[PDB]
């Protein structure tokens, strides 16, 4: 069951107009990648290549949005003068710092 006509009419009812001619990237804030990325992923199981493909797609979208944000003039670089709430706790930051330090110390201690 796939009613394409009904899907199209429902999306027509939903649709918020998204036109670069009419509407700014500051508003719509969406980037559509040209590549399908299923070609970029040869095998589903391979975690490394899957992560790399997602990395590539996200990076391309980020660069495109960044260029559009310069074209619009909206601020984009969060300055060192700024401190604000994080999505995760400074305690979590301290813990991940501890884990990284432990791993590095173990490595170069094994070298020693």
């Amino acid at each position: 069951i796939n009613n394409k006509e009904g899907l199209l009419t429902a999306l027509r009812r939903i649709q918020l107009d998204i036109n670069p001619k009419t509407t700014p990237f500051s508003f719509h804030q969406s980037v559509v990648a040209s590549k399908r990325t299923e070609d970029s992923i040869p095998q589903i199981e391979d975690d490394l290549q899957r992560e790399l493909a997602f990395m590539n797609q996200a990076l391309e979208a980020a660069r495109l949005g960044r260029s559009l944000l310069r074209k619009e003039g909206v601020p984009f670089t969060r300055p060192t003068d700024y401190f604000a709430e994080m999505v995760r706790t400074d305690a979590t930051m301290e813990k991940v710092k501890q884990k990284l330090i432990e791993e590095a110390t173990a490595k170069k201690a094994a070298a020693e």
Binding site: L16, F27, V32, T37, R88, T92
Partner: protein, 220 residues
């Protein structure tokens, strides 16, 4: 005018994130992660499963919310996510399978709680029709309206959507600026990693005619 959007033309959008009565701690962590990421949203928990989906609709009407994100836990092991345009908008059911929350110490990424993300949509969301619908609903959900002042103003994180087999994959990355050698972006994963198998798309708010049935879904 207390719609709390300071903008030329306002994107009045609201998300009500609801959880069910039997959600696992991992699913509650996922709820907390999306609640932190979505600043035009309201958290609520323990909706009785014996109630009705249009009763979810009056719940969203009570909270004045035009979008609802429903977390239904089945077996206490399998997540079901409902994205619905509340008043009379088509709704999508996906099944969430693989779960990774922000509290795991292998992500090594962090951003602003509520800052606007770069929405990185895949191409299949641009060709395929039911993926058209999913893209529209997802844009309306994670849209983070323009002049909404409960958001911080500097863009530093990317929410990327990408289908591989038949499944939507969600990724969250942080933009790190490093100056070029005689400044570009390195993306470092932050948080919610949850794998989506689309199941159904209904025309109504929560009922209505069925339009897409994913005839490749094998249930746990």
């Amino acid at each position: 005018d207390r719609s709390n959007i300071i903008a030329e033309r306002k994107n009045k959008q609201r998300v009500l994130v609801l959880s069910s009565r039997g959600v696992t701690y991992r699913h509650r962590h996922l709820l907390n992660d999306l609640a932190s990421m979505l600043p035009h949203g309201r958290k609520d928990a323990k909706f009785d499963t014996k109630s009705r989906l249009y009763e979810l609709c009056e719940l969203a009407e009570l909270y004045n919310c035009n979008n609802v994100l429903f977390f239904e836990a089945r077996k206490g092991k399998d997540l079901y996510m409902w994205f619905s345009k509340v008043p009379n908008g088509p709704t999508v059911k996906f099944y969430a399978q693989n779960l990774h929350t922000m509290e795991e110490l292998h992500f090594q990424g962090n951003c602003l709680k509520g800052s606007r993300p770069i929405l990185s949509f895949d191409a299949a969301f641009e060709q395929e029709p039911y993926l058209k619908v999913i893209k529209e609903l997802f844009l309306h959900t994670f849209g983070v309206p323009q002049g909404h002042k409960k958001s911080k103003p500097f863009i530093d994180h990317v929410l990327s959507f990408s289908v591989a087999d038949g499944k939507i994959w969600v990724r969250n990355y942080e933009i790190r600026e490093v100056e070029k050698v005689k400044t570009d972006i390195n993306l470092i994963e932050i948080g919610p990693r949850f794998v989506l198998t689309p199941i159904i798309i209904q025309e109504g708010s929560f009922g209505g005619p069925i339009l897409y049935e994913n005839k490749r879904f094998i249930s746990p």
